[PDB]
């Protein structure tokens, strides 16, 4: 029933050390909560500050100020559209040069 989300990074997926990046989860219309997952069991963020990016879809945006090389690696999206969660988006790999 409901489409799997999409994940992207801004400006890109390759970001120098200390710089900023912004993950952009999107799925359809009528999403209540977006969750950005890094290791989905322990570390993740939930937002209700959902924006609309098209007649067809909506998007939430999460941002880290000073990116550590710790912050490199995988990330995925999920959205909760009551009463159920979406399947899990495809992996985004953030790359950070030493």
């Amino acid at each position: 029933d409901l489409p799997r989300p999409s994940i992207s990074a801004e400006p890109g997926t390759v970001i120098p050390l200390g710089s900023h990046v912004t993950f952009v989860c999107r799925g359809p219309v009528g999403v209540q909560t977006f969750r950005l997952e890094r290791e989905s069991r322990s570390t993740y963020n939930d937002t209700e500050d959902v924006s609309q990016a098209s007649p067809s879809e909506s998007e939430a945006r999460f941002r880290i100020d000073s990116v550590s090389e710790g912050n490199a690696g995988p990330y995925r999206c999920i959205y909760y559209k009551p009463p159920k969660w979406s399947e899990q988006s495809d992996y985004l790999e953030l790359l950070v040069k030493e």
Binding site: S42, Y44, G70
Partner: protein
């Protein structure tokens, strides 16, 4: 020279003082239960001065007010940036909050879960408060519905 109206008043005083004393021990128990789980569920780690501020206000059901606070500091200390606490804490915190569902998959979005476990928790101390209440209510009315009647009978014999 009859003991009628007196007993009726001694039992009336027996029940009311009974209920009143029960309700106060019930409420102070409920509070210790909440207090106790607030630490069992590792919420001490989300906000450290959580117990004293629920303590220093009585009315255990006033733990629900802290839900938006708990949501805020969960995302702060176990966010996707890496978090403040260890991964093993965060895993556990997330299961206890009912957001991340033991076997891995998501549970419910952190905004529904937090109030849900808190309300479950006060409803859990309600049951434990209404039990200690009922209990010391009967236990204090007996001992004073006894102490009275022992003193009314000695009033009658003379």
């Amino acid at each position: 020279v009859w003991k009628a109206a007196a007993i009726k008043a001694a039992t009336e005083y027996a029940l009311t003082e009974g209920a009143a004393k029960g309700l106060a021990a019930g409420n102070a128990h409920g509070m210790n239960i909440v207090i106790y789980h607030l630490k069992e569920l590792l919420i001490d780690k989300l906000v450290p001065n959580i117990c004293k501020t629920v303590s220093s206000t009585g009315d255990y059901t006033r733990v629900i007010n802290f839900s938006k606070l708990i949501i805020q500091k969960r995302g702060a200390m176990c966010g996707a940036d890496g978090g403040t606490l260890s991964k093993d804490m965060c895993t556990q915190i997330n299961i206890n909050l009912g957001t991340v569902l033991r076997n891995g998959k998501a549970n419910l979005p952190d905004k529904e879960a937090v109030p849900k476990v808190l309300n479950r928790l006060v409803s859990q101390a309600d049951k434990a408060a209404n039990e200690v209440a009922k209990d010391t209510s009967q236990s204090v009315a007996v001992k004073i519905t006894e102490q009275q009647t022992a003193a009314i009978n000695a009033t009658y014999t003379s």
